[PDB]
Amino acid sequence: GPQSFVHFTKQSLALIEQRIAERKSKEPKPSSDLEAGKQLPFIYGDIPPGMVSEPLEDLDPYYADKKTFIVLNKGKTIFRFNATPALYMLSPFSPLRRISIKILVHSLFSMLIMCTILTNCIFMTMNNPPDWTKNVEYTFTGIYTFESLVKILARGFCVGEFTFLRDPWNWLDFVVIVFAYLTEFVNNVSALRTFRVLRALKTISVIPGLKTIVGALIQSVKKLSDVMILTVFCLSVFALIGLQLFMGNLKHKCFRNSLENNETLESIMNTLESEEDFRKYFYYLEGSKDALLCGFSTDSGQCPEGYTCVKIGRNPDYGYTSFDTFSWAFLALFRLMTQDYWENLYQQTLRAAGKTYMIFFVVVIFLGSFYLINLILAVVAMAYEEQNQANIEEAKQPYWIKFKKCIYFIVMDPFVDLAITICIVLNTLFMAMEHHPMTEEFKNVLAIGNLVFTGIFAAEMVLKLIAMDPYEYFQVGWNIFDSLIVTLSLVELFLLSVLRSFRLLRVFKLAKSWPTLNMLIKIIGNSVGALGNLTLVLAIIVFIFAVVGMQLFGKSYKECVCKINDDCTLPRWHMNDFFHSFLIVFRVLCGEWIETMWDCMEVAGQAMCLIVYMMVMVIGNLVVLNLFLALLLSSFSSDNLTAIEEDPDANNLQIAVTRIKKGINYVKQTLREFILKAFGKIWWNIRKTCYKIVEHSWFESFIVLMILLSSGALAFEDIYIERKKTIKIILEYADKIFTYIFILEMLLKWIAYGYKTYFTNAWCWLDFLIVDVSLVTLVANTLGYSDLGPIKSLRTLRALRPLRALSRFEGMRVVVNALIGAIPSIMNVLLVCLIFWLIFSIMGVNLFAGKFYECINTTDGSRFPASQVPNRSECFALMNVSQNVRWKNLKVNFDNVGLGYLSLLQVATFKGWTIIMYAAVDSVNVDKQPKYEYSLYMYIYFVVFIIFGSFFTLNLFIGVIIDNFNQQKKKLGGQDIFMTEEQKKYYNAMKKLGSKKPQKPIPRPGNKIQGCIFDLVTNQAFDISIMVLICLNMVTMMVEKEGQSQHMTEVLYWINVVFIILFTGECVLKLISLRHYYFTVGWNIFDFVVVIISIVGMFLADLIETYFVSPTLFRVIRLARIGRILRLVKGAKGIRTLLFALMMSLPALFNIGLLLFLVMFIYAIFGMSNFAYVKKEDGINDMFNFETFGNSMICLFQITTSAGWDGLLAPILNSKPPDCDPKKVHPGSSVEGDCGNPSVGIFYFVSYIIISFLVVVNMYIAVILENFSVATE
Amino acid sequence: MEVTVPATLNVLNGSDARLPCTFNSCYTVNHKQFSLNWTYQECNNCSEEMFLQFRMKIINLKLERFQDRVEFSGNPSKYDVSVMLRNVQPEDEGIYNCYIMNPPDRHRGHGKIHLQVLM
Amino acid sequence: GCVEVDSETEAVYGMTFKILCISCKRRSETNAETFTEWTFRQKGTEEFVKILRYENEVLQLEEDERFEGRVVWNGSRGTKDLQDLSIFITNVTYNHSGDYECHVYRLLFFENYEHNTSVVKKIHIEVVDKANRDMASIVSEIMMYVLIVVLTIWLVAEMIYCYKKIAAATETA
Ligand SMILES: CC(C)CCC[C@@H](C)[C@H]1CC[C@H]2[C@@H]3CC=C4C[C@@H](OC(=O)CCC(=O)O)CC[C@]4(C)[C@H]3CC[C@]12C
Ligand SMILES: CC(C)CCC[C@@H](C)[C@H]1CC[C@H]2[C@@H]3CC=C4C[C@@H](OC(=O)CCC(=O)O)CC[C@]4(C)[C@H]3CC[C@]12C
Ligand SMILES: CC(C)CCC[C@@H](C)[C@H]1CC[C@H]2[C@@H]3CC=C4C[C@@H](OC(=O)CCC(=O)O)CC[C@]4(C)[C@H]3CC[C@]12C
Ligand SMILES: COC[C@@H](NC(C)=O)C(=O)NCc1ccccc1
């Protein structure tokens, strides 16, 4: 009640002391709604005028026994002070304490502190500040002291409860103040400034809500214990496997065969220091910082003639890429899990070891990279959903009127809206017609059309304003938006590219009639609406990391620049100033953290760079993922609440189309009226016999075998087939047999099903089309017209033969059914994304049309300095003199809107984006030689695009593809959509392995001894001891490295032998103790198997390293030791359930992987057909090309994850000289030319990386998130 | 390049004086490229006399005014390029100058030491 | 790219024949300067004889009634880096049956390093009067026809048996 409002007087303090005396004699819970930092319950109504900001008696009966008072702040917010005198000196009734409390609660105080923090943040971003900034620094320090002193005078320093030191953030404030004082009094400056960076964290304290957001983030990260344990364990196991396999393989190099002066390899190596010195003895590829890797196997890299492969020197990438030690192997496997630049590691390892080692990378990229990432996403999703449910539950608990009316009739009609929509679409399609190589008349017509459209829009605004007055005009967000767009367009007319491009935003007006374009606007609005605090936390964190990196590493980048750049100038990416530090942090968030980290370590030490980079990655990715999941779930759940009816007031477009259709029907009826006024018993059995035959299993299995045989026969048509003439002949004749068999099968299926039943079936249609192609090619070849252009090209369609297996295999049929059922929403979102990206493509065209041309030196490929050759005229004057000069242009640029689309795809996938960025930020003008970072602040264009078009689009896409699967599951009846009927039974039976109750204890034996052996074996002490022994064995495996001395090798061997005998001893004790009940437990029989394979592998390795010689087989056999450490999962309940989730999801992932492998096979055959003779460049080299089935499969697996697809596509975009040679002659073959086909290449790669995203990401995630919700019950 | 030297050095007559010249170049001190250029001037405006260099090995020019009392006490391998002098007389008083150039670095150092002889 | 295809071992009297000698490099991005010498040991002789030498885009056919005017270069053209070194007999006779050898002398150019290697490829040529049909072709055609016939008979037999059964049951009901 309002009478509870009474001042806190000395008598009240005495009474409260008496109450605490009563409490002591006595020797509950504070009201949650009455805690500090919250608003009063409304039962208290208003505050009396002479009461606000005064020490009022406590309003909580809980504190009635304790000395404590309350203050109230104009704004209905309660603070809970302490009635004890401050510092044993200042009483609560003292002028100092009164004024300090008033100040503290005043809102102007907090506003000033926030402004001070924001200004100090601006001052933090200065690599070298001017001398005079010490005055501003002292101003800031003094303001912080005043704030802290006011807080202390208001609520004591640490005298009891509710004191300055009690709140954690007050610790930070104190730490900042003492550090600021100590640095000045003492005056490594870098550490002092890096600690000065902590002031930015006070923003969380001052700005409301950020504290709760950070608490939520910490609670979220508290739930990832099991996932992080599993991730560390899996990365450790894979690191051990890789260390066993590839130890020292990356030190291989090609070394000169013929050595002068009777030199030796050791003598040479003891002297060389420079890369120039090294290049004289080892084989270096042109423009490479590392010696070419070679191998001793037949499928490894091949050294040139006169060079031999030798293991010596340092590992590539400054020495940071290796498996020589467990630490470096762990770094490599973490890089593989995050999939950052993993294709370089893939290629290096394959070159150094052998192409048969792609199995390691396949297993790692699926068992570790994707599955663990999806586990992390699923766990964060479950945390955010449980936090949302809690929040929802808590919330639940005179002459002018003539023209006004006339124009209101004219310009508010539905047809005006339809006309304006048509005009907007026409204007956008008209502005998408600009290109770098445009003529003067075309420029004129574009200008005229732009003027016409802007005039139309301005006239429409004027009319819609005079019809209805501004006081109502400006009441609509759409009206004010159109007003800003049109006024900016008029400003542009009176005065650029950017102002011209801002008109593009009118496209969003279609969101009213486009349901799935309103979803994107809702996502973007939530990012700054409900989740504004989360976005603000992200921005603050990124700013803090950028400043920290700058302060720590700028001087190092400036000084040790010759360790990372040959020219001794700052590289493209550095931390020497705030903009580049921010760019590095943003790139790390995008997912690229190793190439820049290498230079970081080179200049500024491994410990510092690793610590900072790991902190940045972990924290930034946690926050980014939290924001992503929050946006997704909010938009695709909270938005669904049936707030209002479906268009209760029909949209103007809807009304106009209704009128149009009514008029069309009226015209149709009138025209119809006007024109009417003006003027066998055996055949039936035969069909039965064919049906019985073609529905027989034997027949189905025979046809499946034939499909597999014909499918496989396509893999033998390499470039080397001319060396296998017998196989050539056999394959031609087998092709004829297959065509005959399939024609007969089609005829039988006709006679059996009927024409109607056969041709109302998509599988039958597909089979019929394939056999039609085969028959056409066979007939043409028989008639001898086997080389008539299009007929030759039609032979490439034989790559479609494998498609006949989809209808045969039930799992692939189920998965393709899911894809087919989800295809409409995919098309919807694809259209939305294309429209959204058209804006960015047009803006990029306007910014960068024709500015990527440069004059280069073709020998080195180095851009001529813009002092000489400033423009293309001078470049041509220079070519007329020299010979190896060229006015080249980037292959993927912004010359027109299609090339802009391709460039944006590369930027959004983060593959090849760096080349485009470099060209863009160098771009000067059209027909002008680029300069270094002349247009430096063009990086913002790519930053904004990556944010919007590559984060929000990915929000929308994932959100809609996951509903279309939830809707499919609900429609089927709560049934798994990726699992077959025969797999459903196995899945149901398997679900009971995660819920069986414990069995009865195994009976004690009879003997006194065996019985004593029983008690031990059945003890938690025994179990823990065995676990510790397993851990020690794993440590002994880790300690091994490359180049270790023979003494260490022997001592490690003996330690492992002792471990083996100990584990065998414990197994034998268990056996004799449990008798025959030992094998009733799966973990027991797993341990028995592991023991047996351990013993056998030890003996086999001993034999192979003695009686035989085979290092590869020795290394592979030594991998039996991993089974000893795989037993740690037995006791770890946290990760056992996650692995159970994996084993539950295996059946569906099998079907998905089967379909993916079929798609990869088809694409590999097409690649062998097309790109087998393209020029060796970029990602196409002697070892990764499309010249063979193995090479093609390696490349396709590489780009299944969207890694290096830009590099693989680059050689295929060559189509005319001097890029390619159309009349090149290939020895040993009749094919001519090494040019590529730009259109076929673009379609091939884009479609592949698209089919890739709809299976590796949308379907794999869907399945793993589906089974994680089951395991967790 | 950063060079750390004392502005003024005071030593007693007849005592051995060590001139502290040091640098902290980021790169390793390749002895095959390191360059030294120690010089002496009785005054700032006075001319400078070469008396101790380092091209590939420590070379002392043994000027008459210093006799054989000037030697090298530090080591590039460890970023100390100090100079050691015996029994300072009342004439060595003046200004000492180390000039350093450690490739692949480009900035050229300059360490100046003022030696003073006390009673 | 470069594929080391072997040569045929059968020329028909009175017609043309091309003798293949392709020798590719281990790494195709290297530079080299190749030349070749062909030798021939006629069926009925014991000594290998030099017949021609091709260096710097000029063929020097050593005097030899047998090959005079009956050989022309047919390998890689317009370069000093020869990876295909095939010759072409424009009019086969019976004096062209024997053992051919194709010596390749390649000189790789590296960075502060020159390597001079060598390759030898032997081609045995027998001259006939009528082009024999490939045994592989003959066997494959025979097997194709046999398999087609076998599959057709099996299908028709199954057809007839199933029809008799189905009609029998239909009449029974
Ligand atoms: C601005 C320029 C660049 C547009 C270029 C593309 C247009 C020629 C087409 C292609 C896709 C079309 C859109 C595809 C789908 C729709 C949804 C359609 O409404 C529904 O489908 C409603 C469904 C429901 O209410 O259930 C209204 C037209 C619209 C926005 C279309 C408007 C015209 C678009 C943009
Ligand atoms: C590729 C070019 C050279 C061939 C022509 C295009 C085909 C891809 C089209 C032509 C006819 C189409 C078919 C026409 C009829 C049908 C039956 C249709 O289902 C029904 O009509 C059955 C009854 C029902 O679904 O209610 C399913 C699609 C399908 C196979 C269509 C799939 C697409 C086909 C094969
Ligand atoms: C919706 C749009 C606004 C977001 C995505 C694109 C923007 C971030 C772009 C559009 C226009 C761009 C500006 C256009 C022109 C320039 C000039 C350029 O500098 C120079 O031309 C160098 C001048 C000199 O050195 O003489 C640096 C980038 C900057 C400021 C650009 C900054 C990034 C802007 C604002
Ligand atoms: C952990 O991220 C892996 C990341 N792959 C790389 C190399 O960055 C990915 O999501 N690939 C899935 C994918 C597939 C196709 C097109 C785009 C993305």
Numbering used by the authors:
A (entry chain A): 8 to 34, 47 to 206, 209 to 418, 728 to 825, 831 to 1014, 1175 to 1768
B (entry chain C): 30 to 148
C (entry chain B): 20 to 192
Quote the original article:
Unexpectedly, LCM has a second binding pose that directly plugs into the selectivity filter from the central cavity. We will discuss the second site in a later session. For illustration simplicity, we will name LCM as LCM-1 and LCM-2 in site BIG and the central cavity, respectively. The amide nitrogen from the central amide group of LCM-1 is H-bonded with the carboxyl group of Glu406 on S6I, and the carbonyl oxygen of CBZ receives an H-bond from Asn1461 on S6III. Beneath the ceiling of the central cavity, the Y-shaped LCM-2 is positioned off the central axis, closer to repeats I and IV. The benzyl ring is embedded in a pocket enclosed by residues Ser1697, Ile1744, Phe1748, Val1751, and Val1752. The two amides are H-bonded to the backbone carbonyl group of Thr1696 on the P1 loop of repeat IV, forming a stable anchor for LCM-2. The carbonyl oxygen from the acetylamino moiety interacts with Lys1406, which is one constituent of the DEKA motif on repeat III, and the amide nitrogen engages in an H-bond with Gln360, which is stabilized by the side chain hydroxyl group of Ser390. The extensive H-bond network may account for the stronger density of LCM-2 than that of LCM-1. Based on this classification, LCM-2 binds to site UC.
